[PDB]
Amino acid sequence: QITLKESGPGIVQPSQPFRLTCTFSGFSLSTSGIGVTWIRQPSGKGLEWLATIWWDDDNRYNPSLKSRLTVSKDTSNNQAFLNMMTVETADTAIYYCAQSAITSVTDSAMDHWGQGTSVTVSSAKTTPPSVYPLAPGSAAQTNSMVTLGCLVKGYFPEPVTVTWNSGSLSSGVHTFPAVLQSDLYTLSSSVTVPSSTWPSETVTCNVAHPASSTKVDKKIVPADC
Amino acid sequence: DIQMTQTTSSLSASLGDRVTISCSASQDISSYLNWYQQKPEGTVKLLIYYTSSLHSGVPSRFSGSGSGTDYSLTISNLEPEDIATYYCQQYSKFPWTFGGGTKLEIKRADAAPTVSIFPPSSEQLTSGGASVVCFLNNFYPKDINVKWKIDGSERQNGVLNSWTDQDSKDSTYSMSSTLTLTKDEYERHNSYTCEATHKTSTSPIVKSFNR
Amino acid sequence: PISPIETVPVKLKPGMDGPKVKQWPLTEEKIKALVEICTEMEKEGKISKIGPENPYNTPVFAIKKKDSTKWRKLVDFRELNKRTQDFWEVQLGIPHPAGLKKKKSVTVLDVGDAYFSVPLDEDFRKYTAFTIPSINNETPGIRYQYNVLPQGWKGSPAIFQSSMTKILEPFKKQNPDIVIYQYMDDLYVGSDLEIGQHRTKIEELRQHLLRWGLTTPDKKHQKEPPFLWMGYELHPDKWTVQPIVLPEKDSWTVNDIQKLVGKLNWASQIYPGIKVRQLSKLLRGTKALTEVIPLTEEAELELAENREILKEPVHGVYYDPSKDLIAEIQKQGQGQWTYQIYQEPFKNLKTGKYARMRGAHTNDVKQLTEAVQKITTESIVIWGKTPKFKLPIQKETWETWWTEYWQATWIPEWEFVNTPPLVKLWYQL
Amino acid sequence: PISPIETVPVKLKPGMDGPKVKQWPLTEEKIKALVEICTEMEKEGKISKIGPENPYNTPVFAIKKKDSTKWRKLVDFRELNKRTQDFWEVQLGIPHPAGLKKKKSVTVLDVGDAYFSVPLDEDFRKYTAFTIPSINNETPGIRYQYNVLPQGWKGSPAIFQSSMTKILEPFKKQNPDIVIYQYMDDLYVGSDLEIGQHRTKIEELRQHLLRWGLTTPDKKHQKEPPFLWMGYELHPDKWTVQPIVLPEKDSWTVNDICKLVGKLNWASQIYPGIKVRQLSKLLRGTKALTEVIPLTEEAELELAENREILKEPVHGVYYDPSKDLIAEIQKQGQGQWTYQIYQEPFKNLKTGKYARMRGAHTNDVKQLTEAVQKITTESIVIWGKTPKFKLPIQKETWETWWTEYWQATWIPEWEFVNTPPLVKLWYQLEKEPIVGAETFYVDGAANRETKLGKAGYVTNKGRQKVVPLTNTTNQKTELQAIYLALQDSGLEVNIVTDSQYALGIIQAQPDKSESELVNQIIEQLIKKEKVYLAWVPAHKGIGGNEQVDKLVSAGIRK
DNA sequence: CAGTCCCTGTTCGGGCGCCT
DNA sequence: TAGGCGCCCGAACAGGGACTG
Ligand SMILES: [Mg+2]
């Protein structure tokens, strides 16, 4: 019966501050052992400790950042806060708030975790993706299989929803995690279907980008030359 | 700054097995180590606190061991969830610290990267730009190399890649790799080669084309 | 002149004069402290300088509490405490909460200063004089005396009992579920609530107190590893009596028989239903110890019988609050120690075994004193009186460091004894 | 002048009156001598003529100092002191140079008329009343009372010290970085200032006492090292003890020994290792005070070996804070022990010696332990810190001691210094009965009303022995039995007693004692290769005993 | 047990030594 | 002579444990 949820801004401009809010139920931040810990975890790398605000207000910070950190707590509302000043790209990451607690003379662990918030630092303006098909060329088909791809390039911010043939096709599909390009995202998806079905049967790429409120469909038409 | 080190980064195994992961400290931490499990999704849970005490609700098939500077985590007999990333945190002295984590994978009969290469979509070109996409699918294990030979000549100025996680269904990997060159420079050549170097065939797997 | 409340008179037991005890050496680290807490107590005028003209004296020393990291002055008022008693015991004693023992959590509050606000009988002051040494005897002794109830003198809590009962009327009626006992400089508070809920009520009583002048110390809780502050609370349940037990061998050499006879004999003084003839007969003639005697079926009859006797409540043992209390301690082995508290010989009221503090630094001195403290604490809670100790150590050795490890507001009465392994009796196994 | 210092109130012991002690007639030769003197003190303020109503009187005579041929006044305050209430003396130990710290500038002074400079309690003077008799049976002599601290009175010392301390009180608060060791009427002042400002301060000080009556005459050491303080010589870099003239006389009488021994002790504080146990015992016995006595050789090598060390010049150094302490112990003759305390390689700070035997039956860890205890305290007193030790006893020897012993013990941080004679228990009981030895069942008994009794044993192999003794008691007889069995036995044996007494004594692993019995019972133990003692409740029926009992119970009463 | 001796530990008092 | 402290000795002291009648 215990849970925490991190609230945030999801996206922060460089050299600005952000205030993460952990809202919990199930324990008080007034009871002895208790405290709340703010963990971090950059894209792909591993966990990092950031700070632990305790009930006695005897807060502890990660030395590397104390200068840009601060912790707070609205004990009556079961909320806990974390502020970071002058953020930079490297601050882009997922933040967790956990319910650290000190049970006994030797046991002090982070009993329950949140789910995290996605905080990313970018001075980019939400722009829709430009989509391009991937139809094989000079190596035009034989009685087997074939792979068709889709290219979503130059959008912001994450994420994108990509499906094939409006949700029809979902077996040999691979949507690859995106990557930054001139401070803009770019990803690819690959569908593989038996030649007995393409190009005979239409195969389309479904691309959705929430932020810019756009949805585009791309028909994988076989190449001409 | 009590450095915590899990030597073993990516370790693969199989159901029913028994595994051990090591969390080497940087000084006598007197058994103040905790173990965390982070599933592929991302949720993080508490396995063992105080180097050998199982957190309530954890499967008995979980054991903790360690002393002074060397500590180990051992999973009885693998179930299909266990296969996940693992962390050990120290709390003998702030700042607190976590290992580098050990990703526990899945051993599958080794297979080869199905390569596919593509031309710059007419459209991409229309607007002034071109990228060569090259797919390497369902190969095994992870480690793999790519090379971009244009007109026999190699290049690395414009190469981007992306690796997928292990696919929970058929334990394999995939990998997109994109060569982003301009339009004037694309329409200034002929050969474009993607090259794949996987631990399955001495000869690099290759597929290519010429505008 | 601190308060216009009336001074209560006190007169030491007849034919006894004040305490004329010398000052033991003190370590710089301490002198330095004792000097400060003494300087500042004199300004506030709770204490007064004085010279050679006062023929009495007592020793002071200070202990850096590990509890709060704040030095505490300590005046060994045991002699005085002793010379004055018609007073604090018989006349106006403070009653005991039968059930303070019967709780699961109990904490102690150091309500010392609470005393610094009540005038001490002018005429009686001379008796509380003390002196401060100086390293390498640089200057003579700087000595003072009390003008207000002194910390750690059987009389204070006795006097301040009127005001201390009041201060609590509210809290006690707004939380009748809690228990409160005052033994000298301390307040014993124990509850049945969750620990977290206890900690609170304590931290709340701290306030209520503050709403009255009574300032209580600032115990610290560290966030690094040994969460020592986690034990600040006492639990009158992991408090289990330690009965004697007779070994369990498959076959018994001669040797192994004799010993087991002694124990059974010694223990015969405690519990009377212990017979040995039917078991000693098996050793009828001068035989090599090492010789494996087979236990008779007439024998193994009582061995397994008497043993059954060594697991129950003694021979109608009653505690008489009007008689002293004694405690013995036997250094068992590798960190273990055992004790027994009795009023009459072989009629103990309690028997147990203090395990060990992992940070006992493999120091017997340290562990012993700690046992004393620990054992003392239990006493106060259970019977509300301190026991006289029979310490297993050389006076001149104990007197050299007992301080270094002492962490308490009171000081019990002790003596030294060199009494060897009587019978593994006060059981090791 | 006289001080403005509040006078310290002194009363008389409870229920006593002052001294009303007659005066012995003196020679007109002495009388008119005193009269010069008192008149002088009277004008000086120290005393004052008293009225008739004063009943008290203490004796007073005069004596000559043969050198100056001048007379001096002496009052016999014996009775007053007998009557004077008792104080709580404040001087709590004498300071030691070894505790001083090197100071840029150092000065030492003294005060004149120390006592005659402090007011005596107005309400107590009437008791210091004395008479200075007339030349003849005419008019009553001259009566006088004291107004200042009388010399030779119980109070003078403590009162003057207290006073003095109060006086420096404000000065130290204003110059907290200057150490002044006040010892009675003497001031040692030292600071890390420049030889100029120092005086500018020292001066400020003298003008401070003068304001308070304390006359700082010109008998002060300024930039005059050696500074002669407390009996030592203080050198800028080191310190010596004012030479000691060892008595070398022809024949020695008890008393004359005391003068030596003591002197020697005083010397032990700096002169490395000193033995005295030797000639120490000479005095032992219910000796007299003038009785002559012959110096043994076991007492002669002492003097000889001692004089030796004392002949070679040595010196000590000052304490340095940062550099923690060190006390090294060395073994010596039977009972003796030596130690040097230091902080640098071989620059002794101080040195001493231990010889007390706490108990009759003791061993050599015990004593070492004891020596550490005493060394510790003795530091705490001079440095307010504990020292690190270097002891002749390997961790092995210790690790086994404190573990097996039933009495609790400890020793502070220490390493093992390899320098025999070393310390290590000589024998060792057994935990378990050994197989390949007879189990000797021992016992003994005696009759108080006779002084007689027997003692012997019965082995499992039917063997037997029973020696009878005279002038000995149960406890010695039971301790006697155990002696036989440790002769009349191999190199391995099991003994069985009923005396916790004898049992105890032994487990303690004694390795020396007072009585020979237990010095020999020790010898058998060090000799044998394996022993094991067990105990049984005599008079209980336990087999192996009954035998020996009856065997030695030939005289159970009457 | 009630009255007594044995034994060991500690306190005290005397000389001395040193200091002021 | 006073007060302090130190050493070394022997006496009266106190308490536990064992004995006897
Ligand atoms: Mg006997």
Side-chain angles (χ1 to χ4, degrees), chain A, chain B, chain C residues 1-280 282-296 299-429, chain D residues 1-210 212-237 239-283 285-286 288-300 303-310 313-423 425-523 525-539 541-556:
Chain A
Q1 218 262 298
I2 281 183
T3 36
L4 326 123
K5 180 183 161 196
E6 305 66 51
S7 336
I11 163 176
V12 168
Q13 321 230 60
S15 295
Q16 290 283 320
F18 69 80
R19 190 188 166 82
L20 307 178
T21 309
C22 184
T23 328
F24 57 82
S25 62
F27 54 105
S28 174
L29 227 167
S30 307
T31 40
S32 254
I34 291 75
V36 168
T37 309
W38 283 101
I39 307 286
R40 185 157 87 154
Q41 177 180 64
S43 324
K45 307 185 184 186
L47 307 193
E48 189 170 5
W49 172 77
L50 277 173
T52 308
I53 175 174
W54 298 94
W55 73 125
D56 72 354
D57 284 286
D58 186 17
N59 310 158
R60 298 306 163 63
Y61 295 76
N62 173 204
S64 320
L65 305 174
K66 183 176 181 185
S67 164
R68 311 192 289 123
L69 288 184
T70 288
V71 185
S72 327
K73 59 161 177 179
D74 185 293
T75 324
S76 290
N77 290 38
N78 312 301
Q79 319 197 84
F81 314 87
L82 166 68
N83 300 51
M84 178 148 313
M85 325 306 293
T86 308
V87 295
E88 66 241 310
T89 55
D91 293 296
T92 283
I94 284 152
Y95 292 66
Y96 300 83
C97 68
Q99 181 246 17
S100 180
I102 278 181
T103 325
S104 193
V105 198
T106 40
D107 332 294
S108 171
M110 307 190 238
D111 287 48
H112 308 307
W113 288 51
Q115 278 181 67
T117 358
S118 175
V119 178
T120 105
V121 188
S122 180
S123 34
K125 290 181 78 190
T126 84
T127 62
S130 289
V131 189
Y132 311 129
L134 298 195
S138 76
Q141 37 171 223
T142 309
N143 282 309
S144 62
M145 312 272 221
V146 57
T147 321
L148 291 186
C150 197
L151 190 63
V152 202
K153 176 228 79 176
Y155 62 127
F156 192 75
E158 289 254 73
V160 264
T161 326
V162 169
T163 38
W164 287 94
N165 275 342
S166 290
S168 270
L169 226 33
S170 73
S171 248
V173 193
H174 288 81
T175 327
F176 302 100
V179 302
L180 287 154
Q181 167 77 176
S182 284
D183 295 291
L184 281 148
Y185 289 116
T186 274
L187 63 39
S188 53
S189 218
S190 90
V191 59
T192 257
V193 295
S195 311
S196 65
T197 80
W198 194 69
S200 53
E201 294 169 50
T202 82
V203 169
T204 9
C205 170
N206 301 293
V207 173
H209 176 45
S212 66
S213 287
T214 67
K215 188 118 138 295
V216 189
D217 310 300
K218 235 302 166 293
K219 182 166 185 172
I220 296 301
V221 297
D224 215 1
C225 88
Chain B
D1 296 314
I2 295 186
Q3 282 281 40
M4 289 311 258
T5 322
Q6 288 164 300
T7 351
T8 24
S9 157
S10 328
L11 127 76
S12 51
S14 287
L15 312 86
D17 280 23
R18 171 187 182 103
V19 196
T20 290
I21 305 190
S22 51
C23 182
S24 96
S26 200
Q27 54 203 239
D28 203 290
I29 54 187
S30 313
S31 292
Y32 297 127
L33 220 179
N34 282 324
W35 286 103
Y36 295 111
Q37 168 195 47
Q38 202 214 62
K39 1 269 277 75
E41 317 156 43
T43 72
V44 175
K45 197 165 300 184
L46 175 79
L47 294 163
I48 326 110
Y49 57 117
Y50 198 21
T51 183
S52 57
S53 305
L54 279 181
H55 183 194
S56 176
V58 172
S60 288
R61 61 163 183 300
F62 273 114
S63 70
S65 63
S67 192
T69 334
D70 302 282
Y71 291 67
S72 271
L73 178 38
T74 293
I75 323 178
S76 168
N77 29 206
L78 290 178
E79 291 253 32
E81 319 80 294
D82 302 11
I83 317 273
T85 303
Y86 286 80
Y87 295 87
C88 60
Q89 151 250 180
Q90 155 285 311
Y91 68 105
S92 69
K93 168 179 159 195
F94 283 75
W96 283 353
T97 21
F98 297 108
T102 307
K103 241 174 72 171
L104 179 55
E105 288 193 347
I106 287 161
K107 205 82 194 150
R108 169 202 176 78
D110 51 9
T114 315
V115 175
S116 312
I117 186 102
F118 300 72
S121 199
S122 175
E123 298 87 303
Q124 173 170 40
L125 306 167
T126 277
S127 300
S131 297
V132 177
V133 179
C134 177
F135 297 98
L136 285 67
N137 305 295
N138 308 260
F139 58 82
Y140 188 97
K142 18 200 306 180
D143 337 277
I144 229 185
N145 290 95
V146 171
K147 221 180 77 182
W148 283 80
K149 308 158 84 80
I150 40 179
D151 307 278
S153 309
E154 188 188 303
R155 187 156 195 157
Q156 303 177 76
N157 181 296
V159 178
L160 299 175
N161 316 320
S162 181
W163 296 254
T164 79
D165 304 276
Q166 189 188 51
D167 174 344
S168 51
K169 298 166 196 179
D170 90 351
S171 341
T172 71
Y173 303 59
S174 285
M175 189 201 107
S176 156
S177 172
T178 306
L179 196 82
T180 61
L181 310 157
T182 315
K183 180 214 168 186
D184 298 1
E185 187 151 53
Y186 166 66
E187 273 201 302
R188 271 174 46 199
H189 276 296
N190 198 190
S191 168
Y192 292 97
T193 291
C194 185
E195 208 159 76
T197 333
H198 190 64
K199 79 143 299 159
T200 42
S201 196
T202 311
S203 246
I205 292 73
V206 181
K207 306 265 178 174
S208 309
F209 72 96
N210 278 77
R211 48 186 251 76
Chain C
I2 178 50
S3 180
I5 233 178
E6 201 178 353
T7 208
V8 48
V10 198
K11 35 193 163 190
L12 337 67
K13 292 270 193 186
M16 284 184 119
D17 215 6
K20 320 206 178 191
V21 181
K22 289 189 193 165
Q23 186 70 43
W24 52 82
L26 288 192
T27 155
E28 174 167 20
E29 180 188 54
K30 283 179 189 169
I31 303 182
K32 188 171 174 294
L34 198 63
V35 135
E36 170 216 308
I37 151 156
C38 256
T39 298
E40 188 78 10
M41 258 187 63
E42 129 83 303
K43 282 177 179 170
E44 283 152 68
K46 283 177 288 200
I47 237 49
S48 304
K49 271 201 195 72
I50 57 174
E53 70 292 336
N54 176 257
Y56 314 90
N57 198 103
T58 283
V60 282
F61 71 95
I63 42 165
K64 178 190 198 70
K65 299 222 68 184
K66 250 188 179 177
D67 169 23
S68 64
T69 321
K70 286 298 203 306
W71 294 94
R72 161 79 134 84
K73 192 169 70 142
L74 246 179
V75 175
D76 188 13
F77 280 120
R78 286 178 290 185
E79 283 301 301
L80 176 59
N81 271 310
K82 201 177 294 171
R83 317 282 226 286
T84 70
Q85 180 175 298
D86 217 38
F87 179 90
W88 73 249
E89 203 172 66
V90 169
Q91 190 34 350
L92 17 81
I94 314 168
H96 191 96
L100 203 184
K101 55 184 142 97
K102 298 168 184 168
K103 283 283 160 301
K104 63 176 59 57
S105 258
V106 51
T107 313
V108 356
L109 265 2
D110 180 16
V111 321
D113 320 71
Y115 290 119
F116 290 160
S117 50
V118 185
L120 178 43
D121 175 334
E122 235 160 61
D123 181 5
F124 184 104
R125 300 180 204 196
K126 65 176 95 152
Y127 303 133
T128 77
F130 58 95
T131 296
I132 291 191
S134 64
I135 49 86
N136 185 28
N137 268 294
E138 180 174 351
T139 85
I142 295 314
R143 46 188 322 241
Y144 316 49
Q145 68 180 67
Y146 280 72
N147 295 291
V148 43
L149 296 197
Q151 293 191 298
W153 164 60
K154 290 283 173 59
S156 304
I159 291 139
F160 189 80
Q161 161 200 352
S162 222
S163 25
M164 178 54 91
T165 180
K166 271 205 123 201
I167 308 183
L168 310 182
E169 254 70 64
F171 202 117
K172 271 193 176 178
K173 189 182 161 80
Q174 285 288 292
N175 268 75
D177 254 7
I178 277 196
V179 207
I180 286 175
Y181 188 57
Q182 179 186 17
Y183 184 70
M184 298 208 82
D185 301 2
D186 295 345
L187 212 72
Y188 283 110
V189 212
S191 330
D192 289 322
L193 348 182
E194 196 252 312
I195 190 172
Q197 240 283 308
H198 181 83
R199 273 83 184 297
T200 280
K201 198 64 48 161
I202 281 297
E203 194 66 21
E204 271 180 27
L205 172 39
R206 290 236 312 191
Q207 302 292 292
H208 169 109
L209 286 191
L210 207 43
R211 267 171 60 197
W212 234 288
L214 282 61
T215 175
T216 117
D218 229 40
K219 321 179 286 300
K220 97 168 156 57
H221 320 57
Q222 178 64 320
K223 294 66 184 59
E224 303 225 319
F227 307 127
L228 306 147
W229 66 258
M230 272 293 337
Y232 288 6
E233 9 284 320
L234 259 46
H235 306 143
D237 300 319
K238 197 237 170 59
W239 283 7
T240 38
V241 205
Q242 191 73 181
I244 46 290
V245 59
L246 308 152
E248 288 188 61
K249 283 275 191 180
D250 34 2
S251 67
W252 316 61
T253 105
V254 186
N255 185 52
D256 293 35
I257 319 285
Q258 297 186 304
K259 307 205 305 182
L260 157 62
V261 185
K263 297 183 186 170
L264 281 158
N265 176 60
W266 203 294
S268 80
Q269 309 190 81
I270 310 301
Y271 328 67
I274 314 303
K275 283 284 217 177
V276 246
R277 235 103 205 181
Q278 199 55 50
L279 301 78
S280 46
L282 334 181
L283 317 85
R284 225 65 191 277
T286 139
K287 36 186 154 299
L289 305 164
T290 65
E291 169 171 50
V292 191
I293 300 343
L295 239 165
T296 304
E300 187 113 60
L301 151 67
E302 288 319 66
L303 170 67
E305 217 319 291
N306 281 336
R307 66 163 69 266
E308 213 271 327
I309 325 312
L310 310 196
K311 281 188 293 184
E312 278 306 285
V314 196
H315 233 251
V317 178
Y318 73 137
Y319 158 56
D320 184 73
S322 318
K323 302 177 180 67
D324 287 49
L325 233 53
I326 307 181
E328 296 198 64
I329 292 168
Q330 10 275 0
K331 170 187 177 179
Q332 237 53 293
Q334 282 300 71
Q336 293 191 41
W337 309 68
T338 62
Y339 61 73
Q340 307 82 241
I341 298 185
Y342 58 87
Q343 287 201 271
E344 287 304 352
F346 309 115
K347 249 135 162 54
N348 4 262
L349 317 141
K350 184 179 175 68
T351 21
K353 65 191 270 69
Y354 156 87
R356 174 191 173 177
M357 294 241 234
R358 188 205 7 109
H361 296 62
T362 70
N363 190 125
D364 305 76
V365 187
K366 195 152 170 176
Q367 320 186 320
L368 176 57
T369 83
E370 294 189 32
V372 195
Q373 306 204 23
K374 200 81 196 62
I375 312 181
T376 312
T377 283
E378 276 160 52
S379 298
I380 297 178
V381 191
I382 303 170
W383 307 287
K385 110 131 60 185
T386 267
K388 182 172 166 182
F389 285 62
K390 285 187 176 209
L391 311 198
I393 174 182
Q394 276 304 308
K395 165 197 276 276
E396 277 203 355
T397 297
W398 161 265
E399 298 195 338
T400 304
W401 331 80
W402 79 270
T403 27
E404 286 290 310
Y405 311 112
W406 198 264
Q407 226 75 157
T409 94
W410 40 240
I411 283 179
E413 252 175 66
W414 63 55
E415 54 181 347
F416 313 93
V417 302
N418 186 172
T419 157
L422 303 177
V423 171
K424 262 347 184 279
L425 183 88
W426 280 126
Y427 222 65
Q428 182 180 3
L429 184 66
Chain D
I2 301 305
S3 309
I5 314 166
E6 180 185 2
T7 203
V8 179
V10 318
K11 278 171 164 170
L12 280 181
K13 294 204 172 79
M16 283 190 219
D17 220 20
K20 293 174 288 177
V21 171
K22 50 286 166 183
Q23 170 65 218
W24 335 281
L26 305 184
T27 80
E28 169 174 44
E29 202 267 295
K30 306 150 114 171
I31 300 176
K32 198 53 63 183
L34 286 171
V35 196
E36 294 179 273
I37 324 169
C38 291
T39 301
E40 195 37 56
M41 291 184 281
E42 202 216 317
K43 202 160 185 177
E44 272 192 49
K46 323 313 180 187
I47 61 169
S48 294
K49 198 169 282 55
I50 61 166
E53 85 281 10
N54 185 301
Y56 318 83
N57 193 85
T58 90
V60 43
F61 50 2
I63 188 67
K64 59 187 66 181
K65 197 51 70 160
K66 297 286 171 177
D67 149 63
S68 269
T69 305
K70 70 169 57 203
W71 291 74
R72 182 106 152 179
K73 189 180 88 163
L74 232 63
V75 183
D76 189 18
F77 283 126
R78 269 177 68 70
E79 264 295 315
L80 214 205
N81 301 334
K82 260 197 174 192
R83 279 122 181 292
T84 292
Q85 48 115 253
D86 30 3
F87 309 73
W88 166 266
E89 306 286 345
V90 186
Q91 191 67 50
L92 312 184
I94 115 169
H96 192 313
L100 308 175
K101 321 171 178 187
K102 309 193 75 168
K103 293 293 194 173
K104 268 289 177 191
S105 326
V106 183
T107 310
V108 148
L109 317 148
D110 264 348
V111 165
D113 303 304
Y115 288 3
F116 292 23
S117 292
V118 183
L120 172 59
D121 183 307
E122 187 108 50
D123 283 320
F124 190 70
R125 310 174 168 181
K126 58 182 198 277
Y127 304 130
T128 62
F130 63 93
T131 302
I132 157 181
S134 59
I135 66 182
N136 69 306
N137 190 2
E138 187 206 68
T139 184
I142 307 185
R143 305 294 297 315
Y144 275 127
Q145 122 191 323
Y146 263 85
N147 286 313
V148 302
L149 291 177
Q151 263 177 309
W153 167 61
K154 212 215 294 186
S156 303
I159 294 188
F160 177 99
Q161 277 157 175
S162 257
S163 312
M164 177 60 91
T165 297
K166 260 199 167 281
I167 294 180
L168 300 171
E169 175 63 271
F171 185 88
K172 276 122 72 190
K173 187 182 190 187
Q174 298 293 110
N175 322 251
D177 277 70
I178 305 178
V179 278
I180 348 188
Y181 275 50
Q182 79 154 107
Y183 187 59
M184 202 83 42
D185 76 294
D186 164 292
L187 298 189
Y188 157 101
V189 201
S191 67
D192 283 321
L193 316 195
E194 302 309 308
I195 315 303
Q197 311 182 309
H198 197 69
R199 319 316 308 201
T200 291
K201 224 63 177 181
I202 291 286
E203 183 56 41
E204 182 182 307
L205 195 110
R206 292 156 64 68
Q207 283 185 60
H208 177 298
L209 303 187
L210 185 72
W212 288 95
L214 285 310
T215 139
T216 47
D218 267 296
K219 71 150 65 247
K220 51 85 54 79
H221 321 213
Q222 70 175 311
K223 357 159 231 194
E224 276 180 52
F227 289 157
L228 324 173
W229 172 80
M230 290 305 258
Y232 315 63
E233 291 195 1
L234 304 165
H235 290 81
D237 308 304
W239 69 264
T240 109
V241 49
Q242 279 174 49
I244 165 179
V245 271
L246 43 168
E248 48 183 47
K249 287 188 166 52
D250 42 68
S251 44
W252 312 83
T253 86
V254 56
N255 178 296
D256 291 294
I257 313 181
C258 294
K259 195 154 179 178
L260 181 68
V261 44
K263 260 216 166 65
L264 292 166
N265 291 303
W266 168 250
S268 356
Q269 88 172 83
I270 179 60
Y271 286 129
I274 304 297
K275 311 190 179 184
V276 170
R277 158 79 174 170
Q278 336 266 52
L279 50 185
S280 181
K281 261 294 189 166
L282 294 184
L283 349 175
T286 340
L289 188 54
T290 337
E291 193 203 75
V292 192
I293 186 67
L295 276 56
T296 320
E297 285 289 75
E298 308 209 7
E300 235 322 306
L303 172 53
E305 198 170 358
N306 297 151
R307 298 189 83 165
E308 250 303 291
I309 318 186
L310 192 163
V314 303
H315 68 304
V317 73
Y318 298 169
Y319 170 54
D320 176 301
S322 32
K323 304 172 180 177
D324 45 42
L325 254 43
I326 295 172
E328 214 193 303
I329 323 297
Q330 281 183 342
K331 225 293 183 61
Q332 295 286 268
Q334 235 66 62
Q336 295 170 174
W337 288 89
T338 295
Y339 65 88
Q340 305 83 57
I341 294 187
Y342 56 103
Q343 42 193 5
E344 261 308 76
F346 262 112
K347 296 286 193 173
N348 287 319
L349 271 177
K350 193 176 90 79
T351 72
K353 59 82 171 176
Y354 268 145
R356 190 136 193 142
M357 196 200 279
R358 300 295 302 175
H361 319 310
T362 189
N363 78 30
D364 274 31
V365 226
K366 270 197 183 178
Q367 306 212 336
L368 179 71
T369 260
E370 323 285 347
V372 181
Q373 243 114 65
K374 228 111 130 50
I375 300 288
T376 298
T377 275
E378 202 193 85
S379 296
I380 280 177
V381 174
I382 311 181
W383 301 286
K385 189 196 295 61
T386 319
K388 303 216 297 182
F389 291 102
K390 281 180 147 71
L391 322 182
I393 160 171
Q394 326 179 60
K395 303 169 175 180
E396 288 210 310
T397 336
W398 181 244
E399 252 167 50
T400 311
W401 185 211
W402 80 257
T403 172
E404 205 199 304
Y405 209 167
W406 64 80
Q407 205 104 291
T409 20
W410 157 276
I411 299 175
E413 174 164 351
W414 65 284
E415 231 315 306
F416 160 22
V417 62
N418 216 331
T419 162
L422 293 194
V423 179
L425 329 154
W426 303 85
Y427 68 103
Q428 179 128 293
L429 303 174
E430 285 294 303
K431 305 181 183 178
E432 301 311 296
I434 187 59
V435 200
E438 319 162 55
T439 74
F440 280 112
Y441 292 65
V442 264
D443 192 58
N447 187 60
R448 296 184 292 176
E449 316 177 331
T450 62
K451 87 194 64 223
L452 329 160
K454 315 178 183 191
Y457 56 72
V458 172
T459 187
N460 48 1
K461 296 176 175 181
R463 174 136 45 172
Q464 233 118 137
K465 147 83 69 26
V466 166
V467 296
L469 331 88
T470 58
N471 180 216
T472 227
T473 302
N474 313 50
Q475 284 89 50
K476 299 181 180 179
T477 80
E478 216 115 348
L479 193 68
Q480 193 62 87
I482 297 183
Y483 187 38
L484 311 168
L486 300 166
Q487 301 174 291
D488 295 50
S489 200
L491 229 67
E492 299 194 1
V493 56
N494 294 185
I495 312 187
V496 165
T497 343
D498 50 325
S499 88
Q500 320 77 170
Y501 174 181
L503 176 35
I505 289 211
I506 309 292
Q507 295 166 296
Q509 303 181 51
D511 94 1
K512 173 53 171 298
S513 175
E514 219 78 277
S515 70
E516 284 308 90
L517 184 305
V518 187
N519 237 298
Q520 291 164 182
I521 293 200
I522 287 189
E523 209 49 14
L525 281 34
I526 178 181
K527 204 198 181 197
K528 304 206 169 178
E529 210 165 13
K530 271 192 176 182
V531 188
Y532 163 107
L533 303 67
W535 179 87
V536 158
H539 311 192
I542 301 297
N545 248 117
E546 291 185 304
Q547 266 70 111
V548 232
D549 198 53
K550 287 286 246 168
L551 192 72
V552 204
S553 294
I556 195 183

